[PDB]
Amino acid sequence: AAQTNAPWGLARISSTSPGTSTYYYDESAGQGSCVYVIDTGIEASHPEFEGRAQMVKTYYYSSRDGNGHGTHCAGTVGSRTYGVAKKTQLFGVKVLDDNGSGQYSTIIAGMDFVASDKNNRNCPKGVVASLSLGGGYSSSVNSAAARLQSSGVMVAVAAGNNNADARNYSPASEPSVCTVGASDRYDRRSSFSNYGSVLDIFGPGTSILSTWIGGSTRSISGTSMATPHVAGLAAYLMTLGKTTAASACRYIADTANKGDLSNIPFGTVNLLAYNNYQA
Ligand SMILES: [Ca+2]
Ligand SMILES: [Hg+2]
Ligand SMILES: [Hg+2]
């Protein structure tokens, strides 16, 4: 399949070169997979989700996304126009309030929720979770992310937006999950992107167009935007049978565009997520 005039990040993920605008992908499009978006929620009624999104959990007075961030991230995973895996099922877990804030205890509860909740969902091709959140180093937060991964969910987490070594942030610093840095449309490391040995992969993170609340759309930036490109890619590859939850991060790194990004600090991987799709 070919989607012309796609957001640059989608085009980038299916290209050996920057500077193109068509997204190419196998028509299976993540059908039969599921992606949890652990964030401020998802506006499931957005036309872009086509009935494939639902809220499954909140820790607040409402499950509505009153911020937009979670809706944007979900859009990059699986909206019809702005998404990587255009046929995946999307499940929203609201661990962040409408200010985008969440106590670590609530975030941890949300991760453990997903590890169990996948047993209540139909995801024959596999399960992914996108965590576009983070804070300072916490062994408890890392351990929760590790449990989620161990349970059979491909966990993708934001590296963080501090232009610093991600070793000092959680869940970014957890070795067993997929830690995602951000790049821009000219294949430069995004200026805010964290880096370091704990990163596994980069994805498009600067000036990313996606869904927003009130049935709208918005371009924003962050490692929070790169993460769902990787999460959607994992779901897409799992539907194709190319990899599994336990191996998807490694597979994505194995098959990435290599050595093509600029301003990658010495010691950080130079790997950009790539679907290796041949139309
Ligand atoms: Ca990993
Ligand atoms: Hg967002
Ligand atoms: Hg995004």
PDB file of all heavy atoms in Angstrom, residues 17 24 32 72 75 79 124 140 151 174 201 206 235 245 267 270:
ATOM      1  N   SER A  17      15.830   6.642   2.711  1.00  0.00           N
ATOM      2  CA  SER A  17      16.327   8.017   2.641  1.00  0.00           C
ATOM      3  C   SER A  17      15.343   9.028   3.215  1.00  0.00           C
ATOM      4  O   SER A  17      14.126   8.842   3.125  1.00  0.00           O
ATOM      5  CB  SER A  17      16.617   8.401   1.190  1.00  0.00           C
ATOM      6  OG  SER A  17      15.528   8.054   0.360  1.00  0.00           O
ATOM      7  N   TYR A  24       4.813   3.745   2.612  1.00  0.00           N
ATOM      8  CA  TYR A  24       4.570   2.417   2.032  1.00  0.00           C
ATOM      9  C   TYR A  24       4.493   1.360   3.126  1.00  0.00           C
ATOM     10  O   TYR A  24       5.353   1.310   4.005  1.00  0.00           O
ATOM     11  CB  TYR A  24       5.679   2.040   1.045  1.00  0.00           C
ATOM     12  CG  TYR A  24       5.956   3.096   0.003  1.00  0.00           C
ATOM     13  CD1 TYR A  24       7.112   3.866   0.056  1.00  0.00           C
ATOM     14  CD2 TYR A  24       5.061   3.323  -1.035  1.00  0.00           C
ATOM     15  CE1 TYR A  24       7.371   4.835  -0.903  1.00  0.00           C
ATOM     16  CE2 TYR A  24       5.304   4.293  -1.996  1.00  0.00           C
ATOM     17  CZ  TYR A  24       6.460   5.047  -1.927  1.00  0.00           C
ATOM     18  OH  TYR A  24       6.707   6.020  -2.877  1.00  0.00           O
ATOM     19  N   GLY A  32      -5.299  -7.432  13.813  1.00  0.00           N
ATOM     20  CA  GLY A  32      -5.153  -8.560  14.729  1.00  0.00           C
ATOM     21  C   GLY A  32      -4.164  -8.332  15.855  1.00  0.00           C
ATOM     22  O   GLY A  32      -3.997  -9.193  16.713  1.00  0.00           O
ATOM     23  N   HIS A  72      -2.835  12.229  20.597  1.00  0.00           N
ATOM     24  CA  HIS A  72      -1.827  12.442  19.567  1.00  0.00           C
ATOM     25  C   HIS A  72      -0.972  11.186  19.398  1.00  0.00           C
ATOM     26  O   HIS A  72      -0.760  10.696  18.285  1.00  0.00           O
ATOM     27  CB  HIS A  72      -0.970  13.647  19.956  1.00  0.00           C
ATOM     28  CG  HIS A  72      -0.146  14.191  18.838  1.00  0.00           C
ATOM     29  ND1 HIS A  72       1.095  13.682  18.522  1.00  0.00           N
ATOM     30  CD2 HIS A  72      -0.374  15.208  17.973  1.00  0.00           C
ATOM     31  CE1 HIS A  72       1.593  14.356  17.501  1.00  0.00           C
ATOM     32  NE2 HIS A  72       0.725  15.289  17.150  1.00  0.00           N
ATOM     33  N   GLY A  75      -2.820   8.431  17.797  1.00  0.00           N
ATOM     34  CA  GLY A  75      -2.935   8.706  16.372  1.00  0.00           C
ATOM     35  C   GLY A  75      -1.722   8.259  15.582  1.00  0.00           C
ATOM     36  O   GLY A  75      -1.842   7.743  14.465  1.00  0.00           O
ATOM     37  N   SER A  79      -4.010   5.760  13.917  1.00  0.00           N
ATOM     38  CA  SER A  79      -5.060   6.472  13.170  1.00  0.00           C
ATOM     39  C   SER A  79      -4.967   6.181  11.674  1.00  0.00           C
ATOM     40  O   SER A  79      -3.910   5.824  11.163  1.00  0.00           O
ATOM     41  CB  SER A  79      -5.022   7.986  13.413  1.00  0.00           C
ATOM     42  OG  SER A  79      -3.852   8.584  12.876  1.00  0.00           O
ATOM     43  N   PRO A 124      -4.620 -11.685  18.546  1.00  0.00           N
ATOM     44  CA  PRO A 124      -3.957 -12.913  18.099  1.00  0.00           C
ATOM     45  C   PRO A 124      -2.560 -12.687  17.518  1.00  0.00           C
ATOM     46  O   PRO A 124      -1.729 -13.596  17.561  1.00  0.00           O
ATOM     47  CB  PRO A 124      -4.905 -13.461  17.025  1.00  0.00           C
ATOM     48  CG  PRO A 124      -5.720 -12.287  16.595  1.00  0.00           C
ATOM     49  CD  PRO A 124      -5.890 -11.461  17.837  1.00  0.00           C
ATOM     50  N   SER A 140      11.500   1.092  41.011  1.00  0.00           N
ATOM     51  CA  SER A 140      10.136   0.559  41.004  1.00  0.00           C
ATOM     52  C   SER A 140       9.445   0.776  39.662  1.00  0.00           C
ATOM     53  O   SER A 140       8.722  -0.100  39.177  1.00  0.00           O
ATOM     54  CB  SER A 140       9.292   1.178  42.121  1.00  0.00           C
ATOM     55  OG  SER A 140       9.742   0.764  43.397  1.00  0.00           O
ATOM     56  N   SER A 151       5.676 -10.140  30.651  1.00  0.00           N
ATOM     57  CA  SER A 151       4.358 -10.757  30.532  1.00  0.00           C
ATOM     58  C   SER A 151       3.971 -11.059  29.089  1.00  0.00           C
ATOM     59  O   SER A 151       2.974 -11.742  28.849  1.00  0.00           O
ATOM     60  CB  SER A 151       3.285  -9.871  31.174  1.00  0.00           C
ATOM     61  OG  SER A 151       2.871  -8.830  30.300  1.00  0.00           O
ATOM     62  N   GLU A 174      15.341   1.319  31.864  1.00  0.00           N
ATOM     63  CA  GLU A 174      15.129  -0.120  32.020  1.00  0.00           C
ATOM     64  C   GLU A 174      15.679  -0.872  30.805  1.00  0.00           C
ATOM     65  O   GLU A 174      15.240  -0.638  29.681  1.00  0.00           O
ATOM     66  CB  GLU A 174      13.637  -0.417  32.224  1.00  0.00           C
ATOM     67  CG  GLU A 174      13.251  -1.890  32.114  1.00  0.00           C
ATOM     68  CD  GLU A 174      14.084  -2.806  33.008  1.00  0.00           C
ATOM     69  OE1 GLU A 174      14.423  -2.407  34.148  1.00  0.00           O
ATOM     70  OE2 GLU A 174      14.391  -3.934  32.567  1.00  0.00           O
ATOM     71  N   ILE A 201      16.826   2.571  19.970  1.00  0.00           N
ATOM     72  CA  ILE A 201      16.339   2.945  18.647  1.00  0.00           C
ATOM     73  C   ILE A 201      15.920   4.406  18.641  1.00  0.00           C
ATOM     74  O   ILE A 201      15.597   4.968  19.693  1.00  0.00           O
ATOM     75  CB  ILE A 201      15.124   2.047  18.255  1.00  0.00           C
ATOM     76  CG1 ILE A 201      14.759   2.171  16.768  1.00  0.00           C
ATOM     77  CG2 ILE A 201      13.924   2.341  19.153  1.00  0.00           C
ATOM     78  CD1 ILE A 201      15.818   1.629  15.824  1.00  0.00           C
ATOM     79  N   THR A 206      10.307  15.101  15.800  1.00  0.00           N
ATOM     80  CA  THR A 206      10.186  16.551  15.666  1.00  0.00           C
ATOM     81  C   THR A 206       9.139  16.905  14.616  1.00  0.00           C
ATOM     82  O   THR A 206       9.201  16.419  13.487  1.00  0.00           O
ATOM     83  CB  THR A 206      11.543  17.204  15.304  1.00  0.00           C
ATOM     84  OG1 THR A 206      12.486  16.943  16.351  1.00  0.00           O
ATOM     85  CG2 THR A 206      11.395  18.720  15.111  1.00  0.00           C
ATOM     86  N   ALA A 235       3.735  -3.454  16.181  1.00  0.00           N
ATOM     87  CA  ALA A 235       2.441  -4.085  15.934  1.00  0.00           C
ATOM     88  C   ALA A 235       2.324  -4.547  14.483  1.00  0.00           C
ATOM     89  O   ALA A 235       1.883  -5.664  14.204  1.00  0.00           O
ATOM     90  CB  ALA A 235       1.327  -3.128  16.281  1.00  0.00           C
ATOM     91  N   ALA A 245       6.599 -10.172  20.612  1.00  0.00           N
ATOM     92  CA  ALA A 245       6.754  -9.156  21.650  1.00  0.00           C
ATOM     93  C   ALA A 245       8.138  -9.207  22.296  1.00  0.00           C
ATOM     94  O   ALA A 245       8.732  -8.166  22.589  1.00  0.00           O
ATOM     95  CB  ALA A 245       5.672  -9.299  22.709  1.00  0.00           C
ATOM     96  N   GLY A 267      28.834   6.672  21.539  1.00  0.00           N
ATOM     97  CA  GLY A 267      28.341   5.666  22.476  1.00  0.00           C
ATOM     98  C   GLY A 267      26.848   5.391  22.421  1.00  0.00           C
ATOM     99  O   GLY A 267      26.369   4.444  23.036  1.00  0.00           O
ATOM    100  N   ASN A 270      23.208   4.478  16.532  1.00  0.00           N
ATOM    101  CA  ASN A 270      22.808   5.256  15.368  1.00  0.00           C
ATOM    102  C   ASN A 270      21.902   4.374  14.515  1.00  0.00           C
ATOM    103  O   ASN A 270      22.324   3.780  13.521  1.00  0.00           O
ATOM    104  CB  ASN A 270      24.040   5.727  14.587  1.00  0.00           C
ATOM    105  CG  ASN A 270      23.731   6.869  13.637  1.00  0.00           C
ATOM    106  OD1 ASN A 270      24.540   7.785  13.461  1.00  0.00           O
ATOM    107  ND2 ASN A 270      22.557   6.827  13.024  1.00  0.00           N
TER     108      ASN A 270
END
